[model samples]
Target: LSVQDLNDLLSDGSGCYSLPSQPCNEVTPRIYVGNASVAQDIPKLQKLGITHVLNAAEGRSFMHVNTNANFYKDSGITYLGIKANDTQEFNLSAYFERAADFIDQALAQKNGRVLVHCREGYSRSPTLVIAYLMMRQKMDVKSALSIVRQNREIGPNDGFLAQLCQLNDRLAKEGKLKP
Candidate 1:
């Protein structure tokens, strides 16, 4: 597919995609996607049996907070906070490898459970999880995104969608991603 096609399916014709009704839900075997509020509540997090947390926010405005390792150290949960912007103009592709690494480490645990969150859990965070599936599981963008959508509602911005599509193209050329 082309970038226009990706823009049609991956974006909502706007930079932002939010569905308050969709809520935070389990998307992968070991991953859950949620909002900022859910990520901050320790008791709520513990109840979910999550072993780690990944926050995908820039921490530049009122919405984003740096939920670093120090924050979760008290709870014995692994943490990796990624600084990211959800805007279509931003280059989100740079962090894909590192974010996938964090997710990989978290899911490698015996009782691995990871909560990946952005402000609303529909954009930035899910894109990273999709990247993990594409790179590690050898799935294409469509395949990876379909899997995530089944787990929870997600919408990657236009620029991020372009990046993911580029990844798909690269993987196919390398004979790595499946059709």
Candidate 2:
């Protein structure tokens, strides 16, 4: 499939909720993706038994979610912050490997569950999770995108989609990704 094909699939609203009714969805039994509200809700995160948090929209700027490792410090939650932008010009591909590593290590812990979030739980956050799935979970772009989209509403920007397409191409060449 082309990048446009994957982009079209993500833009499809067939089975999506109008807005998130809950704080997050368990995209996998071990991984959850949600919004800034949920990211700041330490109690709710604790209630969900989240052992780690990957803040994909991390920064001090208005466009970014400002939470850091200290935000989850009192709760004993491991935190990884990515200062990612949701814009089409942003280079999110730079964080793919490290983000995937963080997710994998989170799941490596006993009873580990991670919450990955950005501003609206839409573009930046889901892109990282999809990258993680592709990088480490043996999924091609379409399969990985389908898995996350089936669980949550996500629309990675065109640049991110193109980057994922590149990643898919690289992994396919290495015979590491499932078609």
Candidate 3:
């Protein structure tokens, strides 16, 4: 799907929604990105019926650097933190290896709706989501990429895309690509 296609679906308050680093005005459940001070947003998220907050920010780089567990406890939201290092330089193999486990855990939850976010919600968060789509949802890489692009402006960087393809190839070779 294209960006226009995504915007139309989200704007119409369809099944999928997206909020990229800005407050959303749409009626659908919005997924906010960025490392903003989440104290105020926590209530807003609660009001939005957000049952889970999936934080992909690694280390102490996030704006609200408090432990997610505490934040979740205080806000009455379940927090699942996937601590993957985000370096300026790209390293695909290491990222996918780490992301696979996180994806598995998140998928296993299978509970209320999840709000997945990275710093900008552009690269890392969507990349992992795409991987999850491919691995768990039985989506091919192209279709997963299309779904992600439908929700966000930016797609995975070249190195990350290469790694995703490699991971898919490995899964296919091992006969693990079955849905």
Candidate 4:
């Protein structure tokens, strides 16, 4: 109902969400959420049959993960980058539809699979995946977050959560998101 409520959904009694226990997790049959390690491992991605990579933390800063289309060019992988920061002030919602479109297209291909990742796969990457689900899958924020959490230990920062809440509100008003 509120940002605080959405925030609570991500944390536990200790005010923390579980840390990443693996390099990647299959949030859905066609989608994955993972860390920079997974993104950098071309062979591993190939092994997983990943057709696309969406880097939510792409940039030169220490907070960002440095990888571009060239990184995957030889591997026959489609790469999309978002120079996002894992801070509360960054407006991540701006890329919601763009990311959703990328993921949707990636999955639309035959045997297509996508790995959505960031430096830690906690804050930035999962936020993008959640946004993709909200925008393309018609899931509300709560439902989208719930599905992701059930598959991985994701903790999008308060700022990203707030942006997701905003998306939820706008979509709900337009009768686009699930109730």
Candidate 5:
């Protein structure tokens, strides 16, 4: 699918689908957003060529599934449940740590589409994707975020963006990241 198609799907909040490509599109990996119950549609997702699903919703607040992890596994998709939510006072360091783990998993299992999702697919998932872009793609914070906004229109809430910048700066100073 083209970027435009993905954008339309995301904006509509229906679901996400993927088209097979030789080297997979780097800019956009198959991702979806909607209520949490969507997790039960694992069979449909598998048919769409999705091999992995990343649940970024915090503690089943939005999409409450009875057995999300088991359901995804029984349906033959690898499921990684990473809970994340933006609080009144977001913690950049904590967010970075969680995102780093998820990005590492996604990279390790290369050659498959992983759906990273939260309730609205706006704040949490986008922030983590931005972090993935920075840490794995070696993109600077601004450029990485800009690319996400250009492609998905879902990302970097003002305060979240600022926190990410601060996170990047601190990582660079500590020799933990390269910009």
Candidate 6:
């Protein structure tokens, strides 16, 4: 689906119901997304049994947030760090397949769990997760975005959304993505 179309889907929005859920929660038993605070919470990570991490907003990508492949050093948690910007101008889509491969590797482990995060639990990180869903699940953009949003309120920037739209287009033509 197109970015415009997904915006249209979100138009009938769900009203606020209560306090926000924790920034990190399992979208699936294998995948979670949240802000860095959750990622840094060792107790919480232990409780969640997360064994892998993907930091899209790595050090230098944003001034305030910082983490990298070494952040999980010797912790036995597999880490994939990407220096990504949550902006319309940056084509974050370029790393979709690579990020998805990171996830695929993590999930290959017998008891793997992955936490995908950026500065906030929005934009860049979720965009890559959606791309992974499309690549791994053969889901269309609408279906993939719908599933992710159900798990977390994600708002990828306009450029990222447009890039995903084109991804759906391209993947369909390649006969690898099912609508």
TM-score of each: 0.89, 0.93, 0.65, 0.95, 0.67, 0.89
Best prediction by lDDT: 4
Q: In what order do the candidates fall by lDDT, top score first? A: 4, 2, 1, 6, 5, 3
Clashing residue pairs in candidate 2 (N, C-alpha, C atoms within 3 angstroms): none
By descending TM-score, how would the candidates be arranged?
A: 4, 2, 6, 1, 5, 3
Clashes of each: 0, 0, 0, 0, 1, 0
lDDT of 2 by residue, 89-127 (tens): 999999999999999999999899999999888889889
Model 2: which ten-residue window has the lowest total lDDT?
12-21
**What's the TM for model 5?**
0.67
lDDT, candidates in the order shown: 0.82, 0.87, 0.55, 0.90, 0.57, 0.79
Better of 2 and 3 by lDDT: 2
Q: For residues 10-108, could you state the per-residue lDDT of candidate 4 as single tens digits?
A: 789987668889999999678999999999999999999999999999998888889999989999999999999899999988888899899999989
Please give the distance, in angstroms, between residue 114's alpha carbon in candidate 4 and its true position after superposition.
0.6
Which residues of candidate 6, in runs, are more than 4 Å off? 13-20, 61-64
Candidate 1, run of 10 with poorest lDDT? 9-18
Candidate 4, pairs of clashing residues: none
Q: Write the per-residue lDDT of candidate 3 for residues 56-102, one digit (tens) a residue.
A: 66447543233467767866676766665454355645655455555
Residue pairs with clashing backbones, model 3: none
Stretches off by above 4 angstroms in model 5 are 1-40, 63-67, 172-179
* Runs off by more than 4 Å, candidate 3: 1-40, 62-67, 88-111, 176-179
Model 2 segments beyond 4 Å from truth?
Answer: 13-21
lDDT by residue (tens digit), candidate 6, 18-53:
222677756655889888798777677778888988
TM-score of 4: 0.95
| TM-score of predicted structure 1 | 0.89
Clashes of 6: 0
User: Which residue pairs collide, candidate 5?
Assistant: 36-63
- Ranked by lDDT, the better of candidates 5 and 6 is 6
